[PDB]
Amino acid sequence: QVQLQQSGPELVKPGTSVKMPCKASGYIFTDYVISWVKQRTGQGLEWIGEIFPRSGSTYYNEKFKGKATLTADKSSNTAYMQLSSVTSEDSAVYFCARDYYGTSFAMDYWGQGTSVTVSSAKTTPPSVYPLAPGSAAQTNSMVTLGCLVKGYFPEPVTVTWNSGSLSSGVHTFPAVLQSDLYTLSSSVTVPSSTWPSETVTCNVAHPASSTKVDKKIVPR
Amino acid sequence: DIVMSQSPSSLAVSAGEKVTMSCKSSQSLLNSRTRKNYLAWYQQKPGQSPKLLIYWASTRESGVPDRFTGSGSGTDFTLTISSVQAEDLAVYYCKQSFYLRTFGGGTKLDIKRADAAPTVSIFPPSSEQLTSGGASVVCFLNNFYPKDINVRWKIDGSERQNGVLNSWTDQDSKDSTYSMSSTLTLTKDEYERHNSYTCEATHKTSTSPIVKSFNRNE
Predict the structure, then answer these.
(1) Of B51, B79, B113, which residue is a domain's last?
(2) Any idea what the CATH number is for the domain that residue B209 is in?
(3) Whole-angstrom distance, CA of residue A50 vs CA of residue A45
(4) Which of A111, A197, B2, B112 has the most CB atoms lying inside 10 A of its own CB?
(5) Are both A95 and A135 inside the same structural domain?
């Protein structure tokens, strides 16, 4: 299927170059241009440049000349973008998108984006903790449980419940930064009669450290 | 060399309401071709990659329902949403393909809704955490509206005003509500010097705070 596959979140040190991929599948790589788009967290979409793998021509947003270099390897159906001499201002999500070259000038299929966090800092895995009630209760028809995700760097982490099979009732809070470390939490609400009788587990992933934690929520 | 100007920056309507938003280019986006101004509208929901809704000013993309409608020409363009749904919560971007590309600043769509009060929960620190010289007390204020809410922590009745970290969720795409997290963080030894811990939620929906507490010894 038409699909654009990008590398996972990365921490790089200031002053280094980082090269990121966008592996194409499900369509004719040399018939569509690849566009790159930048997004600082909670800020807008900003076009970087495009490439036409067929010819290898590149066109850039002026602001990214002297910063970004777009390439395409036809033999692997993979486009790459490369940022040089990075700074904290280059911390952002970078998307690739297939900007249709079938005359309808729009990008109809997008990658999942690569989060880049430029800092010197050590990349730290987080500690996951269960949030279970204190031995007191109210509004017992439903019960709320959670996970505390503390002391990681850099963003992002992923929290799911029972491998995505617990879907309803879930709030995952934006991370916030404490003294060079991130912290967030996730809440989940189930029928008071299903817990602890059937299991509830939060599944935390921190791509930047390749850490995957499963914390079963057990009472008390 | 073409700059894009979206307005308004932010936007709030109730479910079922019609809404419109504006996009202007510093130069005309119409080369020729009957129509085909090179102008596209994308919808970006929280934590998702953008989605193409309209191109060539007015042509709807495959699988896009008709309640989204693009219109306009030259340097003046509009996106309309009739019968707004809570699922539509997103930042809406216009992009210009005449020459290179330029995204407009975006318009945030916030949904207006019926006030509702938060369901509050309080959680004492885990055995594990109190095991690494850390004690975080966490208080969830879930499914409320509007987004204004103030939280007051008390330790043995004394309001506590630091070690407090707050975070608001995205407005929920299903019921248009907000939730919030407040985390009070102490050292273990500091936590072990008090008994009663309390979070108090003051929300427009009741002038008397919702109180949740526990005791360390509890």
Answers:
(1) B113
(2) 2.60.40.10
(3) 14
(4) A111
(5) no
Query: Token pair 């807008």 is at which residue?
Result: A44
Q: Which two tokens stand for residue B162?
A: 């630091």
Method: X-ray
Examine the domain organization and report whether B10 and B86 are in the same domain.
Answer: yes
Q: Which residues of B touch A105 (CB under 8 A)?
A: 38, 40, 55-56, 97
Instruction: Classify residue B1 by burial, with Cβ atoms within 10 Å: 0-12, 13-18, 19+.
Output: exposed
Determine, for residues A185 and B179 on separate chains, whether the beta-carbon distance falls below 8 Å. no
B102 and B190, same domain (yes or no): no
Vertex B181, ends B153 and A156: CA angle to 5°?
A: 140
Backbone angles phi, psi at A167, to 5 degrees: -105, -55
Domain holding A33, by residue range, is 2-121
Shortest Cα distance, chain B CAs vs residue A175, angstroms: 7
Which residue in B has a C-alpha nearest to residue A62's C-alpha? B1
Three-state DSSP class for residue B21:
strand
Alpha-carbon distance B204 to B168, whole Å?
Answer: 16
Q: Resolution reached, in Å?
A: 3.0
Residues B131 and B154 in one domain: yes
Domain boundary among the residues B70, B88, B113 is at: B113
The minimum CA-CA distance between A12 and chain B, rounded to whole Å, is 22
Domain shared by A149 and A219, yes or no: yes
Count structural domains, chain B: 2
Query: Half-sphere exposure of residue A92, counting CA atoms within 13 Å on the CB side?
Result: 19
Tell me which residue has tokens 């099979």: A165
Tell me the DSSP string of B151-177. EEEEETTEEE-SSEEEEEPPPPTTT--
DSSP B82: S
CA-to-CA distance for A39 and A25, rounded, in angstroms? Answer: 24
Tell me the Ramachandran region of residue B167: left when phi exceeds 0, alpha when psi lies from -120 to 50, beta otherwise.
beta
Distance of CA B102 to the CA centre of its chain: 24
Rounded CA gap, B215 and A55, in Å? 69
